[PDB]
Design a protein around this ligand. Structure first.
Ligand code: ATP
Ligand code: ATP
Ligand code: MG
Lengths: 406, 406, 406, 406
């Protein structure tokens, strides 16, 4: 019961732009899950996760692809920065935390997993107990087949009003106190929800989810490589590698949820490696990170697509926000293409993040509309190619200024 | 469970190519545990473990030999980076942790031993309780010799239905809560398995495990010797050697599961010793590491062998996974040759990382296939030397690339 | 339980060759506790103990004597490494630990002490309760002097059968259930075993083992002296001597097992003192180490004795372990002298590590036999001067190998 | 109600040898206590303690004089090392601890102080509750002037029997259980002593004792002075002075016993000042350490007196210890004089501690008797001048050896 290499890339194709290779890789990894759990007992142990190591610059999709991947398989996920554990110079943060955190993440996974499952039932019972105070039921009933006319037009009346209308004052009993529907409603929900939920029967779900589906994204694992010094003193970082193997090559670790294996968890490390090369990773890590994939630096089209396609692109969002003031914003193809060329420019000119650059540029170009929105009520402003250039040109052209306000 | 040296080396031979000297070393050790038992009280508690110190390059087998050695011995094992405690002014953990961890590992094993031993007894009584809800048994019974017709076609009915067919709804009491068979089953099993397991028995058992068969493996021991670039931080690395002394000389450490004595734990310290010499260790430690053995670098022939001969060889493992997709992979002998050859080349032209290299090369090689797979069910794909060159020659040629991908 | 100095030196002489003066010092320390134990209330607590300070090279027997003295004393022993507490840039655990550990160590002895002490009592009562089910005793009895004919030939019959024979099916009552002697026996043992064990006592019994018999061995008490190089770190070492004082002065520390008074713990400080001198210890501490004793470096003859005279000498150890495989090892006098000379020579040409060198040397010399043993069953192998030469001479000479193998 | 400068010195003259100056000084400070608490309210605030700073070598009486002084006024006391708080380079110990500790010290003062104070009261309330079970009192009573005939001959009967007689079986109620007077007595006493032990009525006793009579002995405050560096970097210590000011010039500090002032606690810091001079202390401290006193180095006579006079001199102690074996030791004037000259010699020759040196010398000189004591039963050994010189001469003469075994 699992998707496949290609079928996976499709799903990822519905959220990430470009980076097909990387996709194919997280695709395979995810598939080998369903491949192992499909073998004899003697192998299940022998075959270890095919960890992937992503190589690319920022703003190009790395981390998203992992989120999306873990999401795509509702798998416990966690993102850490290799350097977070480098503060060993004097401070102290230990790797165990990674898995430790992962489990938590899982317990929240499984938790929320039950809630949203029967949240309706709760709300139902919740509003099924608010009608009792509105129309004090006369003890004893039932007996015939009038289940349809049983709730009485009374309860049915307040029913419609409650879920769809006024009603915002009364007192409900718990353990009897005055309150208010809009809140007493959110008071019962949690209570009711309790009844449905279970306890120690969360272990073989969370610890299992983790140990069998968890995914870890180890960011900038390149910030913890060799470096110019010596393989002895500058170990303040190499030693951070020597601290991950246990996690990477199967070890254990106790958590406030029990014991977690880690023997076969999917690790996806990533770096730009524009200084150090994956080859500088200690041999144990090289060994355990078999799948190597390089991501490409984004292009204006990517940018153009990242501005539009996304169900919640900054574009749609902005339009949304200004509609709050009565203004009707509209980004036109040329406009978008233009914001796109604006980002690319700045990335190119100055330092180069990636899709990141879209935020300041867009918020910059809309400064005046953003400030004047209130007075632009009822108007229809359209951001075309003209607009954009006579707002962003001056700035983009000015590299120095770009390093500050863009 | 006590086999002879020559035999122990024969098992080891099944998962590790070459390194005979190392195999004999470890086998002698394992073997003495049986010899010591044949001894009288006095000697039995005078004869200590012949801790090993392995000397060799990376990816040649030092650790693999220790795992496999612990496995055929069925003993709680544990890897530890010597450096995990190093610091020129940092923090780190405490060495005793090594015994806490090893002990957890002993409990884990024991739990398993007992569960699978009487898993039936559990599942049995488990469903034996799911039938009671399905068919409320009328209090009081027995009396005659009708044991067959006693479970009444009623229970017998559900029983087949339950075990075989359909799993799916009701409410069973614990501490009365609606559930679902397919799940209430797993719930009851654990609940039932419990009653069977004797805590003190497994706690004591888990201990003897560690105390009488523990095998700890200290990697990168040479990363603790002298150095010379300082005085404090170096005699601080030495600090790690001092801290380990109690464990190797015999001491007691307190753990969740009780008090553990280290006097009979076998220690396998490993090291490349390219910079320092085993003579650079602190005397007390050199004293506690009687047996010394040097493992040798692997050769291309070795890689070919490593590729297919070991038991769950990566080759056989690849084939297994692919089969899951209905694909039949086969490796040409020359295919196997070109691969070992590619790896060697890279290890030679970049960073030599031993047998480890084989993984990365094998993954890259079979990626296009791995991604297709599903779309090749029923096909017999053969990896001949032509396939191995078309997919790796260029890569191997690009020394930069190899530093990134292979 | 208290013997004279002269007698302790006699016990000491069964395991440690030479170092008579030290055996004496230690002998006095011990007899001295018994003496203080003979005083009145007035002095019992107004008698400042006589901690030892051992001065000597490595591998000459300082630790050994303390251990073995702790054994004949049958006292919980612990061995601290003076430096563990220094840190010119670390945390360095706090000395409290020494009494902590010792206590954990005391507890163990006590536990396994009590058990193996009155085990017979349990197994006896255990089976004494299995005969009750075999031959249901008729209530009320006794009265005359028919004590040996009272158990009746019935109980006496099953008695012999039980401990020496069949009988493997029966149901016993605990808290009434069918079982099986083979296991119902063990089941009872632990149950009864409980009865005898006093948890409110042994905890105390532990403190009474510690506070009044506890021996501590502080090593490298010389790696704590002034030094000179700098000044900050020195007072950082001296910090350990300052902090060390209360223990040797006589105080109370708190453990997970209660409060413990360090007042009668015998302290054995020890050091090589190659760079530093006792006179360089902090005045407070010097005066608190009234008993001073030196140990002489060992000589080849000594090695030869260490090799054979001691009770369970490594020689008698190997010969024993080999006979376990049915091999008759005979060490010729010529063979011993060469082992001793080989060790001495390596200690001369590389790092001198005292008697420890004999271990590595002996092991190496014996590996081949040690591996082949099983197949050499029934044969005789004489380790004589010629035998020693073939196996060691090449290695001893090759100074680079000796820094790795011997 | 207080002694006087002279009268105090005498008390100190009863335990310390020489060092009259320092005595006269601690005397004065102690007296100013009784002088301030004797002035108008406006002054009591204005006048602060006249802190004393002792200047002298080790082994001459400093700390002893402070103990004796705090004892002489049963004042809370504490001795700290200035350097203890210098481990600030990387570790961490804070001065608050000092007062923090001081209070504890006080609560222990007041504690054993309270018990023996109202010990009678407890026992009374104890047996007063044991008669209730013996003669179950009839509820309701009193009313007339029959206080003498009220206890009834019944309670009065058991009263005498109890404290002076049999009665050793009964059950008392606590939290109702059978016991035995002989024990049921000691059980009630403590349990009763609890009610008395001023629960919260311990505050205005400890915090008061501390705040009004506390004495702090700050050892080696010279180890935290200027030093060759700069008044900015080497502040790792000068900053330690900047941390005592608060305490010395009155601040506060919270303790698990409440709040403590510190405004006027007597501080007695000391140092040898053979490197740094009191002039190097930061100005604030100099200001707050008004009384400056120099102690002199001990003399053989001092040594001679230190050996004999003390009610528990090492000499008496030894004679005692050996009597445990039947031997009758006797130090003769010439003998002691000789041990004195021997200590002085070594102090002079090598490094010079002080009285300290008496421990090893005496224990060295008695080595043989100490070892042979057992066989010397019934004999009368006399350590005269002869004995000593022909046991200690060769060693004292040998400076080098002196630095090790003396
Ligand atoms: N004969 C062999 N020699 C080397 N590696 C082998 C051999 N057979 C299989 N392998 C595999 O090669 C990898 C090498 O890892 P291993 O830890 O054994 O190397 P190592 O050099 O001993 O490591 P370390 O330097 O950390 O002690 C493992 O994944 C192991 O399973
Ligand atoms: N008479 C002896 N003299 C020296 N070593 C001996 C003797 N008998 C046995 N040995 C063995 O020699 C080794 C030396 O260890 P020991 O701890 O006694 O030396 P040490 O110099 O006191 O050590 P450290 O410097 O760690 O305090 C031990 O393995 C010990 O068992
Ligand atoms: Mg290694």
């Amino acid at each position: 019961s699992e998707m496949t290499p290609r079928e996976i890339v499709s799903e990822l194709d519905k959220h990430i732009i470009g980076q097909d290779n990387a996709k194919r890789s997280v695709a395979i990894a995810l598939r080998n899950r369903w491949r192992r759990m499909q073998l004899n007992e003697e192998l299940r142990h022998e075959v270890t996760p095919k960890n992937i190591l992503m190589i690319g610059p920022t703003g190009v999709g790395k981390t998203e692809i992992a989120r999306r991947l873990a999401k795509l398989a509702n798998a416990p996920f966690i993102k850490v920065e290799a350097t977070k554990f480098t503060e060993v110079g004097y401070v102290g943060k230990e790797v165990d935390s990674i898995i430790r955190d992962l489990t938590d993440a899982a317990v929240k996974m499984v938790r929320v997993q039950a809630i949203e499952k029967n949240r309706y039932r709760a709300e139902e019972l919740a509003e099924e107990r608010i009608l009792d105070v509105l129309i004090p039921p006369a003890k004893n009933n039932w007996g015939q087949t009038e289940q349809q006319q049983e709730p009485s037009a009374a309860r049915q009346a307040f029913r419609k009003k409650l879920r769809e209308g006024q009603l915002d004052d009364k007192e409900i009993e718990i353990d009897a106190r005055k309150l208010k529907i809009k809140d007493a409603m959110k008071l019962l929900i949690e209570e009711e929800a309790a009844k449905l939920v279970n306890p120690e029967e969360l272990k073989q779900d969370a610890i299992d989810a983790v140990e069998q589906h968890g995914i870890v994204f180890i960011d900038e694992i390149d910030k913890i490589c060799k470096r110019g010094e010596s393989s002895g003193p500058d170990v303040s970082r190499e030693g951070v590698q020597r601290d991950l193997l246990p996690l990477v090559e199967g070890c254990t670790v106790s958590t406030k949820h029990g014991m977690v294996k880690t023997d076969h968890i999917l690790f996806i490390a990533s770096g730009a490696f524009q200084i150090a090369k994956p080859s500088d990773l200690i041999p144990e890590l090289q060994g355990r990170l078999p799948i190597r994939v390089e991501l490409q630096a984004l292009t204006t089209s990517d940018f153009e697509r990242i501005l539009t396609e996304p169900n919640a692109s900054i574009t749609v969002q902005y339009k949304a926000l200004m509609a709050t003031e009565g203004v009707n914003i509209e980004f036109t193809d040329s406009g978008i293409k233009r914001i796109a060329e604006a980002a690319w420019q700045v990335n190119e000119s100055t330092e180069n993040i990636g899709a990141r650059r879209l935020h300041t540029v867009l918020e910059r170009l809309m400064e005046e509309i953003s400030y004047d929105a209130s007075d632009l009520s009822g108007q229809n402003i359209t951001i075309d190619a003209d607009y954009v250039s006579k707002h962003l040109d001056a700035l983009v052209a000015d590299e120095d200024l770009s390093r500050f306000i863009l």
